[model samples]
Target chain A: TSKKEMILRTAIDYIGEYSLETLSYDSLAEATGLSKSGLIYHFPSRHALLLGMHELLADDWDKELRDITRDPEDPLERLRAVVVTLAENVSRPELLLLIDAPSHPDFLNAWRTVNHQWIPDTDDLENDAHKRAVYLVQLAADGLFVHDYIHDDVLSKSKRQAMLETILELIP
Target chain B: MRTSKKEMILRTAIDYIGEYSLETLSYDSLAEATGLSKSGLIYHFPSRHALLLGMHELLADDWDKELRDITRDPEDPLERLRAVVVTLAENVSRPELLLLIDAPSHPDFLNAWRTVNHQWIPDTDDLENDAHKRAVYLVQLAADGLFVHDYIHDDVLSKSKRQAMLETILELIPSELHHHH
Candidate 1:
């Protein structure tokens, strides 16, 4: 587990230093002071490595959501927490990984699983208005994340707080 | 100027991206796909970056035309922005084009999108009221979210659900602006 953590951490740093396109077992092996075979032991293929990186990031997000929300049973509270947490914590690299997820089914599924845990699939909700409102809140949070990621200067401190409050108000 | 040949190369590049990964796009691959010799294609697009820029401009022009068709009023920023959101929602089905804009691999891709967004979408910078600014910006963000949502999940929103969600987003616009339209 320790070695696996080290490898994932090194992979993330590699992504930070270089682009995700350049991430490969050969690059990681040299970066982590491990032979190519040693790196392959943990992540047998490039797909596996990409999936691992995504899951690692998702796990951290799950933990943050858990820590902030008071009631796991209350979906509204959970949704609100997602808006707050994502507004406060989403990073550029995480956004990059998300943009790349659609290219691979495995990565996309992992992303869907994480989102499913917090957001109700609109198909299951009976009330049409509630379904739309709830999903819009989720979408708005995602929008803010992407907006902030692409344009740093647009969301000032006051604007971000106002947007967060406005989005949170929509939860009911 | 051989405008027809240039347009053919850009259109083929977009179709190729729809079918395959953007990373796989190259002069050789595009030449093969378009049935044009490498030298002939280079005559239209000298490099891969030029090819991408051409596609970006093409998409932006198409968006501008669609947006103008929806609303002719230039003074109403909110109306124009609402039109932009509706256009973005309609564009969800074309995930490849959305992916091309959102793909962070090239900084220029996003820069091009920002330029287009600024041209049509309302800028909240000038709004005095925080609440009003939030409302306007949220609509734009939610629209963007809806645009990219399907790429991350194969389970798409039903047509009715999408329409309802878009309506909810539209309602977020300030009521005063709604009166002018």
Candidate 2:
């Protein structure tokens, strides 16, 4: 990775450990291997750094979502890709929860379109079982992965497996 | 029945919770919002925990009736799962959202949550294994996550994406169990 890309990756991980509100440019400089001037040379200001941090997260999630959904013609597979891919990268969304608050409109709007870009088209309407099944599984995956972070209890392997199998089976 | 001041206070409390974390909320702030003295607030609800209980009970009561009504067909567990998704979807999307407030700090609220959870869905005693029970609870937690998103972010999970998640959870219900039994 380039030096700037390397710095952003470190900043994202740093915010994951510390709350976003506490992430100042000085702390960021300390976290990244950069002097105060060196950090400002890239970001210019603390606000610029925060915006960059959010932009990186948004881009990473957006890229991951696209990589998972692209060329998967089957909507079911596409939907499954959304949950499975998100579940694999659990830290991304968990980190997102920290940075994403309604009070921060800039942060909120930047990440909003990234999440909904992957839903597949439905074949049936009245008996739209696909829609319901996909959403619940996605939410449940959110439970297994993201929500666990919010409440903070690392789930056991066996427990996580059971719910995932149950969700996968519901795809039909 | 006429709206009681106590009911009014409780409603205000729910809104406060929607905006702020429950652990940091104070009766002083509540009193200031209600334009009432702390003593006046205390007259209706005796303690902070008491006020929490009132808010909890109101939330429980609404979901209890609605859950049972929506998931009336117990023979089909998928129907039950659908009920949970529908109710939770509406709840998570609401401006005045409810939270699992007492669970974070105190273990006492855990039992309260279990009691109300069982009233809506199957209990461990009612089920055969931990997997099924955990599966049921897991779905509830997912709904909880959705509500938190709406509460904290004031965001929706996009209609189609939401429907897809709901549909997936409905399928997660052990539909074949009815066939075997």
Candidate 3:
């Protein structure tokens, strides 16, 4: 792995074992066996480190959606693929980062930018029903991920599948 | 305004989270914020776990009151669930409270949310029909997504977009129930 990916993976593992609150450059440097200056070279500040992490996660998400849909030409098909992908995947570190995004401005901005890539702005949609339908589908997919995050597999396999189908049906 | 000292401390902690971050909260900082001695704060909170439980319960109680106030039909589960979506959308601006509710590491935070949700939302397990269960669960899941996104990106959705998204979820409720509004 590249040094940047290595550091970001180390940070994710660290967050999984410990809490996000305790993550620091010094601690990450110790965890990754890199000098503090080397770590800073990749991520100059805490904000930059977090933004990098968010970007990495977002890239994974975008790739996942694209791979599943084979880079669909239709926007609605792409959204349906997102619903399926988000429903099937649950990463504790990603959820933790999402939960902590509000604590930092740059972190929140990075997330917003990433989401805008997949989710259409309701204001941009031509029809009111289409706008609502698209946004609600996206929200339900997000809710599915958060539900898994907090409850940890409260829904049975069949039920989760059914819920995914229901959410996808909502998309226009 | 007549308030107990414990109540004052809890309120102060909530406000502190709103202004700052949850990690910065501590007995010393809270003591300084509330102007109470560290020992005095400990007397009420006892421990960080206890303090978090107190805060969670207080927020849950306030949310329960809001849900109850907005729900027109106490007996109708769909109406109540709709109320949950509406109330959640209304309170999206309070990112601090959302953080407290969504705090994953704490059992007390999770339990507190379950208590309020149990009282307000219908049990999907009890619904015999698969379609009905999915409908209720979708509304709830959508509401939670909205809640999470509210704090994650405060400016991602415009006011009109949020309102439209909320209306869409509300409309997702099975067509059996008539809208009171």
| Model 2 docking category | incorrect
lDDT of 3 by residue, B36-134 (tens): 999999888889888878887887788889988989886888888888888755544453543553456676677877788787765668433567787
Show what share of the native A-B interface contacts model 2 retains.
Answer: 0.30
**TM-scores vs. true structure, each candidate:** 0.82, 0.61, 0.85
Q: Give per-residue CA lDDT, model 2, range B1-181, as digits (tens).
A: 7665898887788777555545445789898778888998999898888787777666667666777887757566556656766775554322233244334334444444555555455333322256567667666656645545443323455665555555555555544445544
* Candidates sorted by lDDT, best first: 3, 1, 2
Model 2 residue A76 lDDT? 70
Which stretches of candidate 1 lie above 4 Å from their native place?
A12-22, A88-93, A99-105, A123-127, A149-154, B1-3, B14-25, B91-111, B153-155, B177-181
* TM-score (chain A only) for the predictions, listed in order: 0.85, 0.76, 0.83
| DockQ (CA atoms), all models | 0.39, 0.22, 0.49
User: Which scores greater on lDDT, model 2 or model 3?
Assistant: 3
* DockQ computed for model 2 against the true two-chain complex using alpha carbons: 0.22
**How far is A108's C-alpha from truth in model 2 (Å)?**
2.7
Q: Taking the candidates one at a time, how many backbone clashes does each contain?
A: 0, 16, 0
Question: Per-residue lDDT for A1-172 in model 3, tens only?
Answer: 8989999989988875665666898889899999999998889988788888887887787777778885577788778887888797467677667666777677777666557666756675435677677778888898887675544125677677778888887777
Name model 3 segments beyond 4 Å from true: A15-21, A99-113, A124-127, A149-153, B15-24, B93-106, B126-129, B153-155, B177-181
Which candidate, 2 or 3, has the higher TM-score? 3
